[PDB]
Amino acid sequence: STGFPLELLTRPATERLAYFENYTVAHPRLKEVYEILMRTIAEPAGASFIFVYGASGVGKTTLRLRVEQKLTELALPKLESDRARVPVVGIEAIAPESRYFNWKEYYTRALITLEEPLIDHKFDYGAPALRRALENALIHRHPDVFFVDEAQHFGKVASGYKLQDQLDCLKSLANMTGILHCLLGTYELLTFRNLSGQLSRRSVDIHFRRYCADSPEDVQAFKSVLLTFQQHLPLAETPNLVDHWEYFYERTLGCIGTLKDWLKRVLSDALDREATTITLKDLQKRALSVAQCQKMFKEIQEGERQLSET
Amino acid sequence: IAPESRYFNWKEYYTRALITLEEPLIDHKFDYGVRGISRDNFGKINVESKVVAPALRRALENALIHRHPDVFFVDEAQHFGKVASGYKLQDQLDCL
Amino acid sequence: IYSEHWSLNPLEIPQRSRLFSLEPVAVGTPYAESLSSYLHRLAQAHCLTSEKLVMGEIAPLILKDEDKSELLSKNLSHLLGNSDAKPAINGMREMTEKLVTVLEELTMRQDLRFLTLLSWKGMIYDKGLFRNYRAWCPCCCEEWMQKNKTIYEPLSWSFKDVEFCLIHKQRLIEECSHCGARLPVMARLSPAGFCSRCYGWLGQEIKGEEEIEKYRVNIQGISELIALTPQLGYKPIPIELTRKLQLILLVFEQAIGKDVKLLGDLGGIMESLRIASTTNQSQPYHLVKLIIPVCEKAKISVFQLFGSDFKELGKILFGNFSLELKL
Amino acid sequence: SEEYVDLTFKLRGAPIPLDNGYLTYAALSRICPPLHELKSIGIHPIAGIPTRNNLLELTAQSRLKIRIYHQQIPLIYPYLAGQAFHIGQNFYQLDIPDYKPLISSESVYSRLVIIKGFQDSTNFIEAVQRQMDNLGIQGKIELLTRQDGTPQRRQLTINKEGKQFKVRGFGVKISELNPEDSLTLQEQGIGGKRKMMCGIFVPATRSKEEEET
């Protein structure tokens, strides 16, 4: 249904905020990228990298969690028979405190995710020990995919050639276990996509395109997502949000996640004051700064220009 | 902390965050990660210089997720700007 | 608008194994992996020493009331009992029982009990069965490593009465060629095929030029005994084996009744079987001393003795001694 | 007649539930592997004096009785002669077995018969008649009734895995068989769940025994 459950009005503010926060909408770009990603996951076709770009807030993390959950439930009917068979593994890269990216931390965090026993103690049967342990764990536990969120933090190295050596280490990890690695990150990842033939052949590139204001179809889609967000806003009265579509697009750049968090802020502000409708000044209170929007627009424009290679 | 050297010391920041956050009564026995961090007789946790900074960071992560504070306040945050590499400002902010 | 509303709730998959679910090699065949070799393989797969993994996970489940962290900094003998140790851990001893139970619980696997002889507890006497010191066939290890195959120690190597590898016809070697010392089966770090002391190699093309026919019956019978346990599908019943022995005794008595000369060939075994059938049935029988010679004189393989039902066993015995009986 | 035998064991031990079919069958299969694959085998109900809590107190005449072809006894005798089994936490012991013949009688009876997909009494009578013709048997079908006269149903609780399934059956009394057909009936039986301690037929006096109480 287009409307939120009607008994939520009588429920406290926390319940309404929860219903709004765990609610997510499927816009055409998100569902298309979801189908493409799962088609590539089901049939890797010899490609070991599924690099996914996107603006800050297009829904990369949400798509990652959705794919993890759906693959988990797809595999669920057979995990009772076969143990040590973790369906999917998804971890987030850590920006390094030091100047260069740390790989011991990466390996030990991956081991922590796989519930490896006695990680700290370890041994080297010959960070080589941690790398070998991760390789063996990936071989035996048999994960279907391996998401690595925030892949831009991989290239936190002062050496231009070691920038691709990070992916070389990841690739050497991948081959001896044959586990798909679908990295997710911002437009900073574009300097890692197709460097060298090894990363140019076995890498499939998916672009989480945002909703640009040029194509009338994308403008109509943005208006429709505004309409469905308005109809799913848990308020006593439904505020008219489609009219200020230009204002909503100005401070969100078409990023649906930005719209979601901004509307969450406005809804929480209204609920704290026990209001029944959303005013323009309510949106103006929690709108993003003009300089911030300019900076993210510059970044995504540069990323789109770099990715515009045909 | 404004550092004596030209680099912000993330190890000192991590250990000070851990010691400041971990000051409730002794009843909470959380059993943090990493072997180098534990309580003592007087209740003030101790961290040896042998412990590497990233392990201390991971212990801080576990402590923060377990305690779940509403907000982490950092005063005079401009002290994060004491570096030598020009691009290192982005690295510091990315770490935070 | 769009009516699709996704839900990102977790799915709560069933609990995963604490340790990797490594398959045991050649289960049901005369070359099944020993429990010690399986422990070392699991340790190698986890990039941990066998000792370290032991007190990391098996010790808290075995040693019930101790501090696990305080257990992490000890010697393997505190829980394994190196005062005994020996390749006899592969047998039917109590520590073997609890170790197998803990291992099967950790990996929720259902075949580790076949990697030992606890299925024959109360059936086969423990003494005079297993070697005190580690043994190996260098040809087997060299062939396995050259063929990029998994290194392991078969159960047959752990027995005193198995000294030859039928595949390579090579006498088992109990001494490391490099350090000159004899390996204990359990150690801090003893990967299969490696010298547990000097880390030297133990796989070489050693030729066996002895009379292997003398021990052929023993080695083949023990191999059949190991290979048959996983194929039974149940825990053997002691009185089943006792009454099969009694049936063989009756067949022997009928054969002697038909032919007097066979008494000369079978008197000692007749007396031994009669004693074994007069003593308490729950008492185990000496494998190599009693059962293997008994089925040998009955011209029956150990596999046939422990696998076939009473009808098939009786029919084959009657045909073997040309009796006219029909059960 | 004598071509089939009823293996009887003097059974002693703890008191037993009155719907103990799967319990005793599983215990016997635990202590006798070949029992799990035989075809023409069946077990007679275990007699005794019942209790107030739907449990039976074993007496001197209480005994485990197994119907078997005489050409399959050596597959069962080793695993039961003198052997003991456990039902749950209760210990049960069997003595040296004795052999009893399959005697014909004018009328027969079965305590519990189940055929898949038949719960009503009328269609149950029709199905028992169908199996009755399939065996080349002649007789009349009656259902044992309670004090109320209502046909008496008995229930078997198969506790397979974590779950447990319910199968309901009727007591069937068939008379005017002629001794040859009577023997055929007692040996074949009706219901199929003879390993499940249901389908064995008995002379008609035990029907009176069960109808009194």
Ligand SMILES: Nc1ncnc2c1ncn2[C@@H]1O[C@H](COP(=O)(O)OP(=O)(O)OP(=O)(O)O)[C@@H](O)[C@H]1O
């Ligand atoms: N299509 C959507 N519908 C509803 N909420 C969404 C949608 N896409 C994103 N969000 C919201 O955005 C947040 C998740 O962050 P999001 O994926 O948008 O950021 P990202 O910049 O792509 O990722 P990251 O910064 O982790 O690389 C959540 O609050 C989620 O509810």
Ligand SMILES: [Mg+2]
């Ligand atoms: Mg995100």
